[PDB]
């Protein structure tokens, strides 16, 4: 690999707890002497933040990669500027666009380039005796850059470049984020005096800039300044004595705060809205003081743990190929009916073997057909011209739709249309495909009209003469390969079904599992859904019934499709959560009553 | 009793139960039916409270 480092005393990650730390201004507006209740991403109060060290002490030096969830509260503490830069990106492969922020003697550079980083990047400085300064020794953080859709350079400056030791006289906090493409940052500086673990108090963080970059970030890194000197062995693998360094890394969550803007518009205090009941009552009352009494707060609910699935023991496959172009279909006027049941089905056959151009459903999303359980699926077979493929729809018009085959408005099913030109392109033309041109009155949904008599347009009763005003509504087609694409035949199949009427065994490939009792768990019984506790009751179902119902017209009891027992359903737990307090002025201990 | 019995009316949706709506159909095309149900139940609650 690239250059590496040795003498890394691996230790478990030290832990410490923040104390009302890492609260920033949610937005740009200004308020005076109010108590706003914002809802954004914040570091939880009294959370658990992972310590990290780079101080050699000994033989301690660590700055590995860390995951980057929706925000990081990077709070370093430095005295001689040992931690300088940052790395962002997705995999740091120099193939997915990545960000970089270096604090060089020239500028605080920001780059968006496909940089190729080694496994141990850093910033190198040496204490030359001829000139007691700190110059860069090996700036080989990256290999090169191919495409860079965004670059920026800030103003020039000159760092103090300290090479001394001592307690961290200052403090630095940063909250990196990423929303709607945009990349943000926050900062705040305070010359706090301490030697050890992060101090007490509460302070706010101010916005700095908003980068309009569009990369996706998952995992990040950190630069260090190696304090190379003559006492070091003198190599990129073992010559280094860095010195004091310390920085923590927190993670954000979708919490809810209640900030208290003071008169000047600054933030002086904040209360977490879910840490303990007293804070919840403060959040509810929109005040920092709670008067003696009993208050109301959020509700209590038991959360389900396990999910169970039950399905009847069915193994026979559903014959679909013998319906999809087996040998031949029928004409429009005399369409083909077929009832399929008592088999396990699937939809993937409608997505892999032949991606039919026209595939649009109604009432049911096409991708959800696995779980919901069907009942007596119906199929239709016929072929129409490509001009009027839209005629088959719930609420459209047209000659064949209103005269040969009409859909009900409440039709619940999918429709599939796909050309078969090679099968139906005869140079002489196949003319068994017909239509009903005329009819005195419209028809009924899913009703056949096999009448092929001589239609009488007007007067002169026909009596089998086919004279004037006696025409034959049954007319053939002109399907030849020379015809246009619009007139080319389309093969149309209508998938019709109804659900939730009776115990059926037609639905999909889901699999069963064991049955549990006396626990608030989810369930799925032949496509049913809900949540509750399943006990054993004493109801005597008649040997044709399936469900049970209350006076509220809901599901009370069900029947196991396999064991044929009778189970019960009961909601898990309701109830509010009151809070008993003597008063924030008096004390800060509360008693909680679950109703 | 009337407030309970109001919990079984479609108000215009294809079914009167929310779980069936969210299981059989894709949410971006189910938000309208959810809105219908929410409007009906809000009306019932306002009547009862007044």
């Amino acid at each position: 690999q690239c250059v590496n480092l040795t003498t890394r005393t691996q230790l478990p990650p030290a832990y410490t707890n923040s104390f009302t730390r890492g609260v920033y201004y949610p937005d740009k507006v200004f308020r005076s002497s109010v108590l706003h209740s914002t809802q954004d991403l914040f570091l939880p109060f009294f959370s658990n933040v992972t310590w990290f060290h780079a101080i050699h002490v000994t033989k301690r030096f660590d700055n590995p990669v860390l995951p980057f969830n929706d925000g990081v509260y990077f709070a370093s503490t430095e005295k001689s500027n040992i931690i300088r830069g940052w790395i962002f990106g997705t995999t740091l492969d120099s193939k997915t666009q990545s960000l970089l922020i270096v604090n060089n003697a020239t500028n605080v550079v920001i780059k968006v380039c496909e940089f190729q980083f080694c496994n141990d990047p850093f910033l190198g400085v040496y204490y030359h005796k001829n000139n007691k300064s700190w110059m860069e020794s090996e700036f080989r953080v990256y290999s090169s850059a191919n495409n860079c859709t965004f670059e920026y350079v800030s103003q020039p400056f000159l760092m103090d470049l300290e090479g001394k030791q001592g307690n961290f006289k200052n403090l630095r906090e940063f909250v990196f984020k990423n929303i709607d493409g945009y990349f943000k940052i926050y900062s705040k500086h305070t010359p706090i005096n301490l030697v050890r673990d992060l101090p007490q108090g509460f302070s706010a963080l101010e916005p700095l800039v908003d980068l309009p970059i569009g990369i996706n970030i998952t995992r990040f890194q950190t630069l260090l300044a190696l304090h190379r000197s003559y006492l070091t062995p003198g190599d990129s693998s073992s010559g280094w004595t860095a010195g004091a360094a310390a920085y923590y890394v927190g993670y954000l969550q979708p919490r809810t705060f209640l900030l208290k803007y003071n008169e000047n518009g600054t933030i002086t205090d904040a209360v977490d809205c879910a840490l303990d009941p007293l804070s919840e009552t403060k959040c509810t009352l929109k005040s920092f003081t709670v008067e003696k009494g009993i208050y109301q707060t959020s509700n209590f609910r038991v959360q389900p743990t396990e999910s169970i699935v039950r399905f009847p023991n069915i193994t026979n496959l559903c014959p679909f190929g013998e319906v999809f172009n087996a040998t031949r279909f029928a004409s429009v006027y005399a369409w083909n009916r077929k009832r399929i049941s008592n088999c396990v089905a699937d939809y993937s056959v409608l997505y892999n073997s032949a991606s039919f151009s026209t595939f649009k459903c109604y009432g049911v999303s096409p991708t959800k057909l696995n779980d919901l359980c069907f009942t007596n699926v119906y199929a239709d077979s016929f072929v129409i011209r490509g001009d009027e493929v839209r005629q088959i729809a719930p609420g459209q018009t047209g000659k064949i739709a209103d005269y040969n085959y009409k859909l009900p408005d409440d039709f619940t099913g999918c429709v599939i249309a796909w050309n078969s030109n090679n099968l139906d392109s005869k140079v002489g033309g196949n003319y068994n495909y017909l239509y009903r041109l005329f009819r005195k009155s419209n028809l009924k949904p899913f009703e056949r009209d096999i009448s092929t008599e001589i239609y009488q347009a007007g007067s002169t009763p026909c009596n089998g003469v086919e004279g004037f005003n006696c025409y034959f509504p049954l007319q053939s087609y002109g399907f030849q390969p020379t015809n246009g694409v619009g007139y080319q035949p389309y093969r149309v199949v209508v998938l019709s079904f109804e659900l939730l009427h009776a115990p059926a065994t037609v639905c999909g490939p889901k699999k069963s599992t064991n049955l549990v009792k006396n626990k608030c768990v989810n369930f799925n019984f032949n496509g049913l859904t809900g949540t509750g506790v399943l006990t054993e009751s004493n109801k005597k179902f008649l040997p044709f019934q399936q469900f049970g119902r209350d006076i509220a017209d809901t599901t009370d009891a069900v029947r196991d499709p396999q064991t044929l027992e009778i189970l019960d359903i009961t909601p898990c737990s309701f109830g509010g959560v009151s809070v008993i307090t003597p008063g924030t002025n008096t004390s800060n201990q509360v008693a909680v009553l679950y109703q | 009793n009337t407030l309970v019995k109001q919990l079984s009316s479609n108000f215009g949706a294809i079914s009167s139960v929310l779980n069936d709506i969210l299981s059989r159909l894709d949410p971006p095309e189910a938000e309208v039916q959810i809105d219908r149900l929410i409007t009906g139940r809000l009306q019932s609650l306002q009547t009862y409270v007044t």
Binding site: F574, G576, Q595 | -
Partner: peptide
Amino acid sequence: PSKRSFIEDLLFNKVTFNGLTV
């Protein structure tokens, strides 16, 4: 069991789940 009188007892014996807590 309680300290109710006789007429109070006579009056007592003559008079007769979605979030609906009581």
